[PDB]
Structures are given as structure tokens and as C-alpha cells.
């Protein structure tokens, strides 16, 4: 059940393409990208 929202996310993660209504919410997210574990390499 996901519906009904107000406002937009002027911020988006260039790494994957995520969104964040806040500027700090994104910065903290970009972290997960910078350095991580997993065979997903390229
Ligand atoms: Zn991302």
C-alpha cells in the first residue's frame, strides 16, 4: 500500500538515479555507492 504524497525530490543520485527530497538524505546515500562489497565489478 503506497499512494498519496506531497512534494517533489529536487535531488537525485547520479550513481544509480535515486531521489531524495532533502540534500543531506542524498549525500548520505551516495556513500553506499562509494566503496562497497560484492562481486558486482566492471
Ligand atoms: Zn544511488
Swiss-Prot record:
It comes from the Eukaryota. Overexpressed in ovarian cancer tissues compared to normal ovarian tissues. Isoform 1 and isoform 2 are expressed in squamous epithelium tissues. Isoform 2 is overexpressed in squamous cervical cancer (at protein level). Expressed in blood cells. Isoform 1 is expressed in pancreas, lung, skeletal muscle, heart, placenta, liver, kidney and brain. Isoform 2 expressed in chronic lymphocytic leukemia (CLL) and several tumor cell lines. Isoform 3 is expressed in several tumor cells. Isoform 5 is expressed in fetal liver and several tumor cells. It is found in: Cytoplasm. A zinc finger (C2H2-type) spans 11-33. Signal peptide: none annotated. Induction: Down-regulated during erythroid differentiation by GATA1. Down-regulated by HTLV-1 Tax through the CREB/ATF pathway. Up-regulated by the regulator of nonsense transcript UPF1. Up-regulated by the cyclic AMP-dependent transcription factor ATF4. Interacts (via the KRAB domain) with TRIM28 (via the RBCC domain); the interaction increases ZNF268 nuclear localization activity. Isoform 2 interacts with CHUK and IKBKB; the interaction is further increased in a TNF-alpha-dependent manner. Forms a ternary complex with TBK1 and SETD4; the interaction between SETD4 and TBK1 is ZNF268-dependent and leads to TBK1 monomethylation. Involved in the regulation of antiviral interferon signaling. During viral infection, recruits SETD4 to TBK1, leading to TBK1 monomethylation, which is critical for the assembly of TBK1 complex and IRF3 signaling. Belongs to the krueppel C2H2-type zinc-finger protein family. The KRAB domain functions to reinforce the nuclear localization of isoform 1 in addition to its transcription repression activity. This is Zinc finger protein 268. It comes from Homo sapiens (Human). The lineage of its organism: Eukaryota, Metazoa, Chordata, Craniata, Vertebrata. The gene is ZNF268. The chain holds residues 581 to 609 of 947 of the full protein.
Amino acid at each position: 500500500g503506497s499512494s498519496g504524497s506531497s512534494g517533489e525530490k529536487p535531488y537525485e543520485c547520479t550513481d544509480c538515479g535515486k531521489a531524495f527530497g532533502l540534500k543531506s538524505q542524498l549525500i548520505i546515500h551516495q556513500r553506499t555507492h562509494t566503496g562497497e562489497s560484492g562481486p558486482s565489478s566492471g
